[PDB]
Amino acid sequence: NPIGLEMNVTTAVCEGFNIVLASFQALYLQYQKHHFVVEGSEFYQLHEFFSESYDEVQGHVHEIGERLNGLGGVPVKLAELCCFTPEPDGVFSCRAMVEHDLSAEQEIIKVIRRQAGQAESLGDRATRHLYEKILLESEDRAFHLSHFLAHDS
Amino acid sequence: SPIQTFEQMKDNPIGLEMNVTTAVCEGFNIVLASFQALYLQYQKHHFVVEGSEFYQLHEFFSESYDEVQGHVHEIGERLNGLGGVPVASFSKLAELCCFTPEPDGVFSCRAMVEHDLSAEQEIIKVIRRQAGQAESLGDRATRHLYEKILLESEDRAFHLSHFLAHDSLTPA
Amino acid sequence: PIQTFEQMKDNPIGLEMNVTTAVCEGFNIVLASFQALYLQYQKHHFVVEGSEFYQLHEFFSESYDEVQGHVHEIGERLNGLGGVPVASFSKLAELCCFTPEPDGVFSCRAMVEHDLSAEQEIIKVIRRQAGQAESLGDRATRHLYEKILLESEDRAFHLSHFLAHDS
Amino acid sequence: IQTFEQMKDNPIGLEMNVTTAVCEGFNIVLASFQALYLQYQKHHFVVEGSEFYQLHEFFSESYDEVQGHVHEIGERLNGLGGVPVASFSKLAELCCFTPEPDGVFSCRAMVEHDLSAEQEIIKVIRRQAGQAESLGDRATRHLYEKILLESEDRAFHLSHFLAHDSLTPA
Amino acid sequence: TFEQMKDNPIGLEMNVTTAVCEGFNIVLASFQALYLQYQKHHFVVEGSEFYQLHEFFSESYDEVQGHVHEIGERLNGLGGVPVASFSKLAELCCFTPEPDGVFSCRAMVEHDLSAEQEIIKVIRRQAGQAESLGDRATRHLYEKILLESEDRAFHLSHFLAHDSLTPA
Amino acid sequence: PIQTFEQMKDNPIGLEMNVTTAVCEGFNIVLASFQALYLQYQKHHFVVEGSEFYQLHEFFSESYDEVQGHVHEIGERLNGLGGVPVASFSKLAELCCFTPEPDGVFSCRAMVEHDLSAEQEIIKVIRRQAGQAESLGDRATRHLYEKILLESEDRAFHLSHFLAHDSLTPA
Amino acid sequence: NPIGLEMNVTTAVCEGFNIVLASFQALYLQYQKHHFVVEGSEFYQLHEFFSESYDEVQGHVHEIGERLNGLGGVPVKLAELCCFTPEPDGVFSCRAMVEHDLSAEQEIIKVIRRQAGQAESLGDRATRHLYEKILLESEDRAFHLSHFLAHDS
Amino acid sequence: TFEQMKDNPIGLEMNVTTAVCEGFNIVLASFQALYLQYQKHHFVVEGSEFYQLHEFFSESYDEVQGHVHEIGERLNGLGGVPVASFSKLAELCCFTPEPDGVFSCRAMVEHDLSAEQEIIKVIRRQAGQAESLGDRATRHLYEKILLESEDRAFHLSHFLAHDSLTPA
Amino acid sequence: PIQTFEQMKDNPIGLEMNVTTAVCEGFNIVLASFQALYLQYQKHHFVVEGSEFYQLHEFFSESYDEVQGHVHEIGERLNGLGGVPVASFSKLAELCCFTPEPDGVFSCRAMVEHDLSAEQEIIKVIRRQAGQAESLGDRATRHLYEKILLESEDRAFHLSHFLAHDSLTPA
Amino acid sequence: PIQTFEQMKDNPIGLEMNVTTAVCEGFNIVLASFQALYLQYQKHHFVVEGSEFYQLHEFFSESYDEVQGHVHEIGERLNGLGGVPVASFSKLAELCCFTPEPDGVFSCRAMVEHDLSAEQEIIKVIRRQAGQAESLGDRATRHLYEKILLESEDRAFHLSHFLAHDS
Amino acid sequence: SPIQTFEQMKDNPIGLEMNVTTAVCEGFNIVLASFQALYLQYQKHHFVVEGSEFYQLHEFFSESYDEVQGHVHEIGERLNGLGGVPVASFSKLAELCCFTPEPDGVFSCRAMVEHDLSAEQEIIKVIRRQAGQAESLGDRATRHLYEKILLESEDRAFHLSHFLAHDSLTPA
Amino acid sequence: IQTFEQMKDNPIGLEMNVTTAVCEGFNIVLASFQALYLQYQKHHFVVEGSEFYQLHEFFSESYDEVQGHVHEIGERLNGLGGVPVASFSKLAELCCFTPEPDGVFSCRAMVEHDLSAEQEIIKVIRRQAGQAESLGDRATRHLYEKILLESEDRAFHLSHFLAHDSLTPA
Ligand SMILES: [Fe+3]
Ligand SMILES: [Fe+3]
Ligand SMILES: [Fe+3]
Ligand SMILES: [Fe+3]
Ligand SMILES: [Fe+3]
Ligand SMILES: [Fe+3]
Ligand SMILES: [Fe+3]
Ligand SMILES: [Fe+3]
Ligand SMILES: [Fe+3]
Ligand SMILES: [Fe+3]
Ligand SMILES: [Fe+3]
Ligand SMILES: [Fe+3]
Ligand SMILES: [Fe+3]
Ligand SMILES: [Fe+3]
Ligand SMILES: [Fe+3]
Ligand SMILES: [Fe+3]
Ligand SMILES: [Fe+3]
Ligand SMILES: [Fe+3]
Ligand SMILES: [Fe+3]
Ligand SMILES: [Fe+3]
Ligand SMILES: [Fe+3]
Ligand SMILES: [Fe+3]
Ligand SMILES: [Fe+3]
Ligand SMILES: [Fe+3]
Ligand SMILES: [Zn+2]
Ligand SMILES: [Zn+2]
Ligand SMILES: [Zn+2]
Ligand SMILES: [Zn+2]
Ligand SMILES: [Zn+2]
Ligand SMILES: [Zn+2]
Ligand SMILES: [Zn+2]
Ligand SMILES: [Zn+2]
Ligand SMILES: [Zn+2]
Ligand SMILES: [Zn+2]
Ligand SMILES: [Zn+2]
Ligand SMILES: [Zn+2]
Ligand SMILES: [Zn+2]
Ligand SMILES: [Zn+2]
Ligand SMILES: [Zn+2]
Ligand SMILES: [Zn+2]
Ligand SMILES: [Zn+2]
Ligand SMILES: [Zn+2]
Ligand SMILES: [Zn+2]
Ligand SMILES: [Zn+2]
Ligand SMILES: [Zn+2]
Ligand SMILES: [Zn+2]
Hints:
Chain A is mainly α. Helix content of chain A is about 75%, strand content about 0%.
């Protein structure tokens, strides 16, 4: 390790980095599928939102991956280590599309929080910090999805 | 310690006289107050709208509060230029408001579109009367600025009325 | 009147006059169709309203800009080949591929369907004229036709999504 | 729903007494500007000769300017509650000037034709802007004066295109 | 309505969302007052150095509006309601806004500095609260706003320093 | 000279020379005033110094290019309306509405005051010419005149703001 | 189908669209992993190249996907329908990284060519055309990889 | 070396790569000659309409250089060697370049038009060849270059038309 | 006037007033010539018309803003070197190196030729002042003078190119 | 000399003078270190050559620009808190975290290793000063420290890849 | 039909005389020819380089052929301005070339870097002698343009020499 | 490999007779400009007062200008085959002027200090540019004249910053 962190903590943080990376990759490809297949009266809204969300989540991926390899691990079984349940096959309701996306982001929020706690416990600040950086934007995306799901028109 | 208290103006560096800069200045203050209230309302709507069309309303409300903030900015800069004092207190900003601001709380998307629409209309009438005043009194620049603010705020009210039409790709 | 809308003139790229005449009256057919579709999209941008009025406002406007691009392409290529593009209202109306929507405000539903029908009737002539231009050996024209066709098909796709029964 | 004769209410506080007049003036102006847009586009397409590049680019820039004019006037027109003209029947009926017949004409000829169209659209615009002022609608009078400014500029540039001067000696 | 909270899509309990959303509302109200004041100062500033203060006040009220918008979006997302009317924005504002009327540029800079200081205190404390209840993203947003607010205070103090090219 | 100065020719937009003569005379005098104002603002961008040297450096530059943009608008429209714009040194000298600053460097305050006075008398000339153009039915001239008026009134605002007896220093 | 193509050909082209989409997705994620994990003396070169290549290949993906859903199918088993062999786990030689990438792009080139032939046979031009559009750039990427693999310095 | 071919990373046989790479070399040589000529014309053009031809010649030689670079990169990728020296670039060029010296603008436009026409013929034919041997990407690149070359010829012919604002 | 024209003051870069006086005189005359050239190019952007109206429209505009950029460089450097730049109408009139075009619209060819002659005599003045600045050891003045020379020589090239007896028409 | 490099002055944000003094001499330590590292990266950009000389030319240059950003941040924050930043060569040299590379051209290998060692010695002080500033309640300073630290760690990562044994 | 044959000039619209514009013009033609050859060589190198560092050489060669093309452009525009005729034939472009162009074929990366380097050097000496000539004869602008072309081409040769140094992170 | 005394060969065709001299002049100029960059940066950091914003932004823009100067001169210096100065020992030894001592000084004082530094760096630049001309190296003489132009401009602007004039009356 080339930053002075003990092996102890680098393994433990790369562990969670691969969990969140697999989950974020699943989220990215599912948002991509949604961007592809949405139709209906509000489709355009969703058409853009999904495209703005996957372009967002992959960002997460890359820097996790870039810093994951940085700490001495190997970035990602993408099916094994993913924290949430991926979308089944076929095109669903647009409403269930955003419901699935909602819950996926919620569970990745949770594991990101736990990993930030672990990184803080053992004295590696930057990882905790970056987890917080992603956490704010993913919470924001959850806000916007639930706004999509509100019973109003 | 104030050097130019609210209801006390001075001179203007343009060559106008105070038979009409005073009139145009407190005609400006009304529109400034109501436009500030409308900007705050559009910002709250940007914040809290939800539902089927919520993305459309989100972005439209941000666009519109930026437009009205630009109106506020130029009205205030010109008002200070001609010798007036702009309103800033919540007290007077609530007093001089030409329309009734929306009460606090989340409304249905339709309800806030209606509130916004008639707020716009009631500011449009103030603006037209003040443009007529500025024309009668020989102040060209104020009437002309009023007229272009008028044009694009009428455009804003057009788009607002368009969101309220009873039509859609849905069966409703 | 130096040249009129039936006299065909030579081309500076080395094509024979038969393929010139054929490809160019096809050009003018689908250009008149594209201009009619452009103006339909434009006034639809003007008159659309309702719950989803922002989405369609944007979509209509982008569509009439892209069809304007198509029209400039076909017109420049058409004169370059030695023809003369259509511009009169009467001729334009006549050679339009589809029946334009009658003036007056229609429902947003009906407007979307009018646009999608106009685009499919234009896609028909584009496919056909592409087959033609390929048979006559006009490769650059065929290539142009293919581009215009693909993005017209994509517009048909986004119309198809606008009219789906969901939410 | 609404056809090209019946009018809808306006959400701005203007009376249909004024709306009807300003929107029919608007429709005349829109038909005129659409005819000029098509003419300038054809001119960009078919122009050729020694000064071909100048006229190519000038024709294209002015057709996009008049295009902008039609979007502006059309969106305002709909705002008042009227219905804009679109099909070729009523665009030919309601057009201010006589459009150029089909076929590629001389450089001189179609520059002059554009001057003709611009001049008489200017006539309509100015006097119906006076009308708009009389009706108490300031916003459309202002919009009219901006459009009149830009079209008078276009007429100036065409006017200079057809001046009797050149670097080619007399 | 006001004085009410709905649910949450990120998994925080209402014990934490109510408490942090009240502080968002307070900070948003004071930031809106500071935005209006910075705008008034950009309008009415004049004198020897008036262009400096012109540009600084404009920059500052746009930064403050950015803070306001981020806090408002996050506040509604957390299930609260942002304040918008003048009555509660005057009530809940942590500092006393400048009374109406034109003040001299120096007094304007002093008012802005002390307003920034009080809002900094409120921000620090609500950030501490947010940290104790386990809301880390709120905490992070508060700290970003706090850093840039502290720099705004730095620049105001620099404007207030007793030094010049003039022998004053 | 194929078209002599004071010889106005036909316009291609349908105005009559009774209005074009007057509005081109007005255009030429405000053009001369603005061409002198451009050079004075530019001279101030050159020679200004002092404790507030930076602010007025950039203010004078921005004002001189605003004034010279006014110049292009007025000149292009004027020649569009048959007339000929002023370009001769003596001509502008003649037709300057204000007195240009005498030569040499002055105190920055005196320079701001000179610029303000030049602005203000151009204000008066512009308003009188706008009234003229309105009465004679030339709407576009009056409209351009109006936004020239708006931005130059803003410039005069900023100048007098420079002139206020206030500062972070004692005064 | 909303463009006038018979069901006959739409099914047949969506078939190959999912093959090439799964292959391109595997290629994209593998180029991403390479962008993550490359080290050595020339790493920077590869560091950027991989990032410029995956951003490229995903482009392919999206428009395939956007037009796939367009023809009436459902876009993507990503492991099942992929035409080439994905990378095994761990960080390999940088040379074998680009060798694996080389062969992956070669085989997707081949199936793209066959799908273009099929689309041409049955009269749908735009698909054949788009396959050609992607084919040129993927051939170019193969050129650049083999250039990376040349025995010279 | 010249007159040699190596392997291929995209799976075409040398029966097709040799044959299409020879035509790439021919088209690249003629395009380099046309680029040099358009540049010389941009340099030496003068007269009544000289600014039009100035800008057109510059635009045209940059378009032709784009064609040259795309063909060269694809040619090396296919396993061939691009031509670069003056001897073989003068040999393999399909048209006769303009002799040295300044010509009148009209003769320059005529030379450029006929050069574009001959290169169009060569391009069409090598595109047909490429199609028959199953090289589709080469075919597509050739057709793009052909479309924009045909438009260059269109604009040259427009410059050569007998019409003007002058009564000439 | 706190600093009178023809009264040069101390420079903060270490030159002696023997060289600054001469180079500021030269700067002022080339500044006056370029300030007249800017106005003449601008007048040509205004009043030009004909069959080649478009080309010279944009050429005259680009040339006048190039010339006025020369003006800013020269003026800022001049006041940096103690002197004061010319701004008075009569002053520029005096110190114009060429004869400005008489008033009224001329044929476009005559206007191009007037601009070319103005350019050429500014060429001569610039070269003489560059030799002066070099002999007296002022390298930066001479260097700026040299690129002014380069771009104005390019402008003269383009003007004479306009003047060639050649076209797609018969001549 | 109004204020000198030991007199500390009040802060306008409401912090107590103890945390001011502590956080600000930490600021000056790591700012002097950052400036030394910046100049080392700059002359390495100057003097690097070899087979991979383009990669390193670019990397060195981007690194000395990013460290310049760090230095501006720390200096502005440091004066704002009430301290005075270091600028003299003697003081800068003394308070530099690491031993700067001695003048003269070194191998690209050795230069990369010198830079990576300087960055690790600076990361040490950044981590430590972040812990400090957090203990004293200076939250904005701690946040700044965290940003600077993370991207310094990323630079250490790209150095680590430059020195790997591959190809 | 040529109106100004290669070795036949005319007048220059600047006020120079033909004792030195002729000299500077065919001094310009040499550098134009060699710079055109170098641009073609750099383009071929952009095309055909491969190997360990091939990305670096790829982009560097494109950068450098753009730089030398800019040199060619300004030399040619100024040459036509002062009354000369620019070289364009392959015949004369090969004749007047100051250095020997690389023979056709793919070389090792090192070999083409060496060819490029010494081509640059041999053009640098031509450029310096021509700058001295232009200075002696009183043509300032040509010498100054020569000097800035000189500066950035010396920079190009610096970077070239840097690629050739016997150093690297590899054990070689 | 190469230390700060021995010189390497240049690939441009200049002789070490010239290279040694121009590179030691270069190193003097580089040390001077690095000292001025650090000074301008400190000035941007610690400036305050009534005109604080002016000097803030001016100091920062000029420190980036002198920064550009050091990149330019350093890359050319290495090009000749010399070795650039970097550590604080030789930057303090070889610097043209006396750097400002530590601590925040008056506005007047450090504007004047910057004027001092600029003036004497101008001295060095001009006479050693004359030297560069005598040696037959035209490119570095040209580069020197551009840097001299920009630094004389900076000296002008500082000079005007300290003029005895203000809108605050006397
Ligand atoms: Fe690693
Ligand atoms: Fe799992
Ligand atoms: Fe005021
Ligand atoms: Fe009220
Ligand atoms: Fe034709
Ligand atoms: Fe029909
Ligand atoms: Fe309507
Ligand atoms: Fe009619
Ligand atoms: Fe909510
Ligand atoms: Fe309160
Ligand atoms: Fe005229
Ligand atoms: Fe007078
Ligand atoms: Fe579908
Ligand atoms: Fe498989
Ligand atoms: Fe190869
Ligand atoms: Fe041949
Ligand atoms: Fe001075
Ligand atoms: Fe004279
Ligand atoms: Fe301080
Ligand atoms: Fe130390
Ligand atoms: Fe010539
Ligand atoms: Fe030779
Ligand atoms: Fe070296
Ligand atoms: Fe020393
Ligand atoms: Zn990366
Ligand atoms: Zn949002
Ligand atoms: Zn403002
Ligand atoms: Zn709209
Ligand atoms: Zn076109
Ligand atoms: Zn889409
Ligand atoms: Zn064209
Ligand atoms: Zn619109
Ligand atoms: Zn938002
Ligand atoms: Zn103009
Ligand atoms: Zn014009
Ligand atoms: Zn998409
Ligand atoms: Zn490449
Ligand atoms: Zn390339
Ligand atoms: Zn300046
Ligand atoms: Zn300046
Ligand atoms: Zn470099
Ligand atoms: Zn700063
Ligand atoms: Zn990286
Ligand atoms: Zn050129
Ligand atoms: Zn700052
Ligand atoms: Zn560099």
